Design a protein around this ligand. Structure first.
Ligand code: E1C
Ligand code: E1C
Ligand code: ZN
Ligand code: ZN
Ligand code: ZN
Ligand code: ZN
Ligand code: ZN
Ligand code: ZN
Lengths: 232, 244
């Protein structure tokens, strides 16, 4: 309800930069109430790129229809940042709309176990965390980085070239957080290193976008790593 | 860095096994041998780690180091004596001491080394030397063949997270042998061994995925016990079912 925020159905959109919006969707978790999840919408000349679905097919369709209304450019592809419902719940809606989908090979391998629909294409990563470029064709400003196991074994991150923005997804929590949120599938040993690897991959990003709070500064990365140091 | 921060000899000699310094070698097939090295761990005696040696035409291929550099050098010495073909490459099956502790011995000898990209990424944290090359995997677990150059009969499969998030497995094409490494424990096991780095949620599926990937392998080779039948896979998966 913050000024400049736009509503379409159950979804809220905030412009972060001339060509970048955050999408926010909400799901009731019985016992804990409504939980926000954020992803990104990127205008890349005469096409649109999506990072992460909403919780549900219906909510993901609302994202696609808002893009049609407000941006009116075709969605070329989507990248989804791990096999949990907040990031991949809406895969069927992307596929029905004829959007090409990309995830970590590991995300696609885990998807069935995690009750998610696999992406059509698999990203693979060098030992240094950077996507093998042949697996991420025509990704325009999307720079995809695998920081290592943290929130999950499969979690990936995305920088937006020509912006100050990097997307930590569920790996990064906000700079005032008490906790690292859901650690059910987490690597408690490697998490802190993974948070720091994300920071080092995108050294000049000043706006850190994450799944479960409003955009923060780089302080979110060093706070997440400081919290993660305490897990081991 | 390493979880281990004490090399010894095995006691249970066994008839068809060959002692070579502090290591043990067993021929499993005309072109396949098991290498075994031992660490004394207080309260648990001589702890075996097993890997594989494969002869493929005029080349030898190695799966896994020994626990230590000095032990891994003795694997190379044994290969020179018993096979006398050059070691074309080694593949190591995750970033733990038993599987990657001897990387320096391979690199010293000019042997090209391969691991899961994730193993190489985790190596520094795990106190291991990274392999020279990284394997990547398709969404169905099979190695991307462009990343496994001249692997010949070594058929590398990532079964999913289990013993660790980076554990890989290796079928030996043209044989009845599949290597489960530390993912699979034998049908006599009372535990899944070290779960310090394990994925308790996905372990059972990963164990079953290994079995389904190598459906006709009748000899299952694993890190910490003698080769077993396919029962080792199902018994492991059923123990892993109790973690979730
Ligand atoms: C807000 C904390 C949170 C997370 C998280 O920390 O990322 C997830 S997730 N992506 O499923 O693990 C959930 C859904 C169960 N919740 C409630
Ligand atoms: C014999 C059980 C075992 C395992 C295992 O279960 O694989 C490992 S490992 N590869 O480091 O996790 C060790 C060394 C700590 N030990 C003693
Ligand atoms: Zn998650
Ligand atoms: Zn999340
Ligand atoms: Zn899970
Ligand atoms: Zn291990
Ligand atoms: Zn082991
Ligand atoms: Zn570890």
């Amino acid at each position: 309800m913050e000024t400049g925020d736009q509503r379409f159905g159950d979804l809220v959109f905030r412009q972060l930069a001339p060509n970048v919006w955050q999408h926010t969707s909400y799901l009731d978790m019985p016992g804990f109430g409504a939980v926000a999840s954020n992803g990104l919408i990127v205008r890349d000349g005469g096409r649109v790129l999506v990072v992460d679905t909403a919780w549900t097919d219906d909510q993901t369709a609302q994202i696609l229809n808002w893009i049609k209304q407000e941006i009116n450019l075709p969605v070329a592809l989507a990248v989804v940042t791990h096999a949990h419902q907040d990031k991949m719940g809406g895969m069927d809606a992307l596929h029905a709309a004829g959007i090409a989908t990309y995830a970590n090979a590991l995300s696609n391998q885990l998807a069935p176990q995690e009750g998610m629909v696999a992406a059509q294409h698999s990203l693979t990563f060098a030992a240094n965390g950077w996507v093998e470029p042949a697996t991420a064709p025509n990704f325009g400003p999307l720079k995809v980085f695998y920081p290592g196991p943290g929130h999950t074994s499969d979690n990936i991150t995305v920088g937006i070239d020509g912006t100050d923005i990097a997307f930590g997804g569920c790996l990064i929590k906000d700079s005032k957080a008490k906790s690292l949120g859901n650690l059910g599938d987490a690597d408690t040993e490697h998490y802190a290193a993974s948070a720091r690897a994300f920071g080092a991959a995108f050294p000049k990003a000043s706006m850190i976008v994450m799944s479960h709070s409003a955009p923060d500064s780089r302080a979110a990365i060093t706070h997440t790593a400081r919290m993660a140091d305490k897990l081991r």
